[PDB]
Amino acid sequence: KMRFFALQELSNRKPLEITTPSNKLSDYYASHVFDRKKMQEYLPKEAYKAVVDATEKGTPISREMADLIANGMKSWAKSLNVTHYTHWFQPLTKHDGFIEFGEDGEVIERFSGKLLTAWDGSSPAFVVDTTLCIPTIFIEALDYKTPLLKALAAVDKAATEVCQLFDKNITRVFTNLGWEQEYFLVDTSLYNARPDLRLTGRTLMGHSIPPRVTAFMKELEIECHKLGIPVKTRHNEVAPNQFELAPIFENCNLANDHNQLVMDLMKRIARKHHFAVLFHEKPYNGVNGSGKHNNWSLCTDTGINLFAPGKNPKGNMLFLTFLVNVLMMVHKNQDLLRASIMSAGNSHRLGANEAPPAILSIFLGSQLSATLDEIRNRTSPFAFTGNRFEFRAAGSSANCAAAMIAINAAMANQLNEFKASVDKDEAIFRILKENIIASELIRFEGDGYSEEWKQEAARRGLTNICHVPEALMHYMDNQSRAVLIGERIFNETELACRLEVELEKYTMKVQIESRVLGDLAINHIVPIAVSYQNRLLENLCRMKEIFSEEEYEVMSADRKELIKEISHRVSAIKVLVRDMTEARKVANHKENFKEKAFAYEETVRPYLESIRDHIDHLEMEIDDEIWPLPKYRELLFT
């Protein structure tokens, strides 16, 4: 009765009108970001030279140079009528006017440099609907930025040093991250009419470019550009109502920050367009999941993709050195990566419709492949896609950082290692070949889902872990620690948290899913089943008493059966839920977060599918006239 108010609701939905600032991008791209182009303008001759010396790998920022900046910074934002400032920061999961009483007692607006939990001098401040946002690092380390920043640092020092063995120059090596954002959209109305979709982000049940949308994108993009994020492409995915959008790569940290922000933008904007953006990795069951690829590469300060072969690759010894290296890292750090992308949501995705199974294994592709013996296809975790590697394992909701923090530090180590080792001008070839032979195992090239590879790799010793809890545990696994704590990225106490808070999440997520599905079953689904069952009963009940037993026996036949069928399901559900409620109960009591997790993945998680199977069947039986929830057919097209 509300589901329909939804269908009828969207019968008419004039797609919003947009605009487009000027016809020249250059006119507004970055319009809303206090970037150099503008610090040079608004900041004092000196203060500016300082933001640079600081961002020029050097720093630090004087409490003096701060106010120097901060003041200039505001002056800019005022040009946008911003009236509040805030420390923007993504934690492992506040607006202030400038208002201030002056000496003379009169009120004034002021932004003290004393307000930079520490601003990431690296990422420019940006403005969103009257609010200056200062990217900062939450402080162990309760955020994501810090861990990354460090991870990225290590990678640099490391790769730079190892770069020395060639072109003596090369002061430093940067990390470029090009991400690809996938998602689904649902008309808000329909969405609300589906409680499991709200609250869980994914349908917990259910039997398996439009103008409206275009306009959504029309805006999103503009707003992104203004925000500095360089959105390059946008197209719709394999599944219904699924779409992607990717920008041009950017020094990892920024890239990430940017993506993070984009998700924000998308949500705010979507709502405005009477849509709901679904970022879960598996919104609808039985249809392409959503993923977030991470195209990784390492540009050196003197130039050089450092991952780009190009003409006679056997000659480009530098490249060879790095490629083979990556190989070792991906290989030597399987579990670590698979952990940086595992999540209650992603679990539902990887290992399926175009989603890499939890089995890391690089793809070099014939050409470069055989070439490695001398010493582009998806369906696989890592993949050399040409002058860069693409890491598909990542979920679509995850914060890139995680995946990067791992991959990068992991690489950092593997490098600093290759270096020490290759220290016994012609040695390289020794270690290089030593490593190629060493990796081998890790390299693959075919149907990554094929039952072929399922064992074909298990044989090589390549681990395969589906269970989130387990898969996660490996954060504390010695090898990982060697990389994480090794490279001074985390200290015991920290890594400890990380792993917990991570398990913590999973546990809750799995819980809510359960909680919801339980209530929805008992409160929404069942009550209907009954209602319909009555329809059926009232039928026989009368029929039976109007036809000769003979007639009634043959006419009621099937009907009578279905009633049984229904009564069966209902009861079944009634139980499963109870039992599940119990499971959760006990589970919730395991005196140890670490166990609590397993408890769920172990005994609770299972019911989710159990309960469903029934509901779904019921959906097929009951009258479409009724049936509380919007049906997939509608969530996907109607």
Ligand X SMILES: C[S@](=O)(CC[C@H](N)C(=O)O)=NP(=O)(O)O
Ligand Y SMILES: Nc1ncnc2c1ncn2[C@@H]1O[C@H](COP(=O)(O)OP(=O)(O)O)[C@@H](O)[C@H]1O
Which of ligand X, its own copies, ligand Y, none sits in contact with 355, Cβ below 5 to 8 A by type? Answer: ligand X
Residue 237 touches ligand Y, criterion: CB under 6 A? no
Q: How many CB atoms neighbour CB 501 within 10 A?
A: 14
Residue 388 touches Mg ion, criterion: CB under 5 A? no
Nearest alpha-carbon partner for 410 in 471, 468, 458, 338: 338
Q: Is 249 assigned to a binding site? A: yes
Out of 123, 136, 176, 416, which residue is the one contacting ligand Y (CB under 6 A)? 176
Q: For the CA atoms of the chain, what is the radius of gyration?
A: 28
- DSSP summary character for residue 282: -
Nearest alpha-carbon partner for 479 in 409, 432, 383: 409
Out of 388, 505, 584, 605, which residue is the one contacting ligand Y (CB under 6 A)? 388
Out of 71, 83, 387, 581, which residue is the one contacting ligand Y (CB under 6 A)? 387
* Closest distance of CB 327 from ligand X, Å: 22
Q: Is the dihedral of CA 596, 597, 600, 601 positive or negative?
A: negative
Nearest alpha-carbon partner for 503 in 590, 409, 580, 583: 590
Number of residues that bind Cl ion (CB under 5 A): 3
Collapse the DSSP code of 149 into the 3-class scheme (helix H, G, I; strand E, B; otherwise coil) and give the result: helix
* Closest distance of CB 369 from ligand X, Å: 21
Residue 262 touches ligand Y, criterion: CB under 6 A? no
Q: Is 550 assigned to a binding site? A: no
Residue 333 touches ligand Y, criterion: CB under 6 A? no
Which of its own copies, Mg ion, ligand Y, none sits in contact with 387, Cβ below 5 to 8 A by type? Answer: ligand Y
Residue 237 touches ligand X, criterion: CB under 6 A? yes
Which of ligand Y, Cl ion, Mg ion, none sits in contact with 178, Cβ below 5 to 8 A by type? Answer: ligand Y
188 vs 290 by CB, closer to ligand X: 290
Out of 159, 185, 246, 304, which residue is the one contacting ligand Y (CB under 6 A)? 246
* Closest distance of CB 188 from its own copies, Å: 8
Q: How many CB atoms neighbour CB 15 within 10 A?
A: 15
139 vs 248 by CB, closer to ligand Y: 248
Ramachandran region, residue 170 (left: φ > 0; alpha: ψ -120 to 50; beta: rest): left
* Closest distance of CB 8 from Mg ion, Å: 33
HEC sequence for 342-360: CCHHHHCCCCECCECCCCC
288 vs 399 by CB, closer to ligand X: 288
Interaction pattern, residues 158-187, with Mg ion; x per rule: CB under 5 A: ----------------------x-x-----
* Partner residues linked to 100 by β-bridges: 108
Nearest alpha-carbon partner for 111 in 136, 86, 79: 86
Which residue stretch of 60-68, 288-296, 467-475, 480-488 sits at the interface with ligand X (rule: CB under 6 A)?
Answer: 288-296
The burial class, CB within 10 Å (0-12 / 13-18 / 19+), for 500 is middle
Interaction residues for Cl ion, span 571-590 (CB under 5 A) = 584
* Closest distance of CB 198 from Cl ion, Å: 12
Out of 238, 248, 458, 508, which residue is the one contacting ligand Y (CB under 6 A)? 248
Nearest alpha-carbon partner for 613 in 204, 193, 288: 204
HEC sequence for 483-507: HHCCCCCCCHHHHHHHHHHHHHHHH
Out of 244, 417, 601, 619, which residue is the one contacting ligand Y (CB under 6 A)? 244
Residue 67 touches ligand X, criterion: CB under 6 A? no
Interaction residues for Mg ion, span 290-309 (CB under 5 A) = 293
Listed in sequence order, the residues at least 6 apart from 260 whose beta carbon sits closer than 8 Å to its beta carbon are 90, 399, 400
Q: Is 297 assigned to a binding site? A: yes
Q: How many CB atoms neighbour CB 44 within 10 A?
A: 13
Which of its own copies, Mg ion, Cl ion, none sits in contact with 97, Cβ below 5 to 8 A by type? Answer: its own copies
What CA–CA distance (Å, rounded) separates 99 from 78? Answer: 13
Q: Is the dihedral of CA 40, 41, 43, 47 positive or negative?
A: positive
Number of residues that bind ligand Y (CB under 6 A): 16
Q: Using CB under 6 A as the criterion, which residues of the chain lie in contact with ligand X when the complex forms? A: 180, 182, 237-238, 244, 288-291, 293, 354-355, 378, 392
Annotated binding site for ADP: 179, 249, 297, 392
Annotated binding site for Mg(2+): 180, 182, 237, 244, 293, 390
